[PDB]
Amino acid sequence: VGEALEYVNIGLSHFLALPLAQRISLIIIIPFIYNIVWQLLYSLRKDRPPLVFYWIPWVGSAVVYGMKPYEFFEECQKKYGDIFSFVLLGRVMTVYLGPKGHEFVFNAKLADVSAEAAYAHLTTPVFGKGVIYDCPNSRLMEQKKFVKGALTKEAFKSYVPLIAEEVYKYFRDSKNFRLNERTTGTIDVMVTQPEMTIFTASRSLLGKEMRAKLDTDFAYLYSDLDKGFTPINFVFPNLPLEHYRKRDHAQKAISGTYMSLIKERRKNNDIQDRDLIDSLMKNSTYKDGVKMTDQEIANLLIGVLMGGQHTSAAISAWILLHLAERPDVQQELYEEQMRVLDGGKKELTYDLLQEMPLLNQTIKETLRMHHPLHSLFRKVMKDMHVPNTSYVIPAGYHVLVSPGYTHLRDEYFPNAHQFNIHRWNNDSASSYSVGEEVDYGFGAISKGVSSPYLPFGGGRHRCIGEHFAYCQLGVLMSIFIRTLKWHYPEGKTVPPPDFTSMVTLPTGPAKIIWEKRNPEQKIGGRH
């Protein structure tokens, strides 16, 4: 009876007097044992979705999920159906696949889930404080409104010639091309596209000064800042190491430069309508009267530029890679250019961009096959019951949604792993609210998010960058197509995606060989 409790205390005491060898081994064994025990008991619960079994505690299914998340999702879906959890480096991720999954996560009430609690630890160090995910959602909603205010049809009309100019400059000056000197060459598209993207997006969103500053050793700070933008930071945001310091330094130095330009313009009253900076200078007052600081303005510009950097660089990379084994498509895109721009005797404008459906379909189809963000997350804040199920997702869990996975299902996109731009005949718009709409603070967007095609997400956290992305990728590709033909080195094909990077970029080196359609044509201007 009571002799039992004595031997508990005795057994407790003999424990701590075990040989240290057996002691260190014990400290490994019993959480291992317990984990299996706990998993097995968890399986009983009918108000929890299935949990993918894992051996190593805490680590969970991290390695298999990290390397091939869609193959992992496919497997889990065969066995368990569309709702299932899995452990990932100390967190419980509840996946919900398919259009119902989109509905569950993207249209989750503000009360139930938090994007900032899922994302802030990565982004805040990189972008800086007070903006995006380092603030309440209603602040974010309004920051998105402010940014959108520089992303208008008239802005795109003026961006097009500037982006065009940057792309031509790059063909002229970059070692990777130099078209006034070489008629053919080889490039790594994972070198060329990040540079082309930063050059074109700096010039148009940030302006001529911030573009100019890229022709200096200031450019090294973007590289530094970029290295804090990696998934590692989702779990180790701050570690006393050098690249964590090069990041912190870069955020300060880059934001300082933007603040310098901003304060400079206010000084001379040079606030026009040129770029996103001008725009945020005129329009960054919240509905409660608080103005964003010059520091928050600058931090937001870093965020925006960083966001648009990696998604677009990735996509232009993939477009080049898919087109390299598809001279039929290159030929077809080339004809559309000849028709819409009168054999090239018409200058590219934003309006004419809208009359190039095949081009835009190519972007659309590349966005389907290569969603740059394979997993979007939220942290669960209030217990969530899953509709038409017994399941309840408790606070402290995370939900994971993956439209990119659905993009690659034959059920919704017949022959989903074939690149086919003609599957978007009669549907070349970047996206569009198929029905009723809703405004979270940054404009009216689709109310339903059940579309199997969701390259830009949906709900309150929806992308506001899609028309800029289409504008930028569209001018870029229009010119690539008109200027060059390109193909793979012998025996090379489309590389598989890297799923461990921030975006699903191509696995390197991803090389193509280009050649000038007109070996004799020259790009003017000085260099």
Ligand SMILES: CC[C@@H](C)n1ncn(-c2ccc(N3CCN(c4ccc(OC[C@H]5CO[C@](Cn6cncn6)(c6ccc(Cl)cc6Cl)O5)cc4)CC3)cc2)c1=O
């Ligand atoms: C350790 C073992 C190894 C095998 N392993 N184990 C696990 N993993 C792993 C897991 C998951 C992932 N990732 C990939 C990246 N991913 C992700 C990245 C960015 C992201 O961004 C969401 C928010 C914040 O950033 C932006 C991105 N963006 C959207 N449009 C443009 N960019 C964002 C929004 C707004 C602004 Cl202003 C800027 C930015 Cl960057 O949206 C969401 C998910 C999460 C899963 C990678 C590796 C591994 O590598």
Ligand code: HEM
């Ligand atoms: C091909 C290009 C891009 C794709 C496919 C893409 C995709 C996405 C997706 C899926 C989301 C939602 C994330 C989530 O719900 O967790 C998102 C959010 C967002 N993106 Fe993009 N993006 C692209 C480019 C851009 C560009 C160019 C900009 C700015 C110019 C931008 C700015 C933003 C912003 C401000 C948000 C809101 C984040 C939030 O509300 O939490 N993106 N994007």
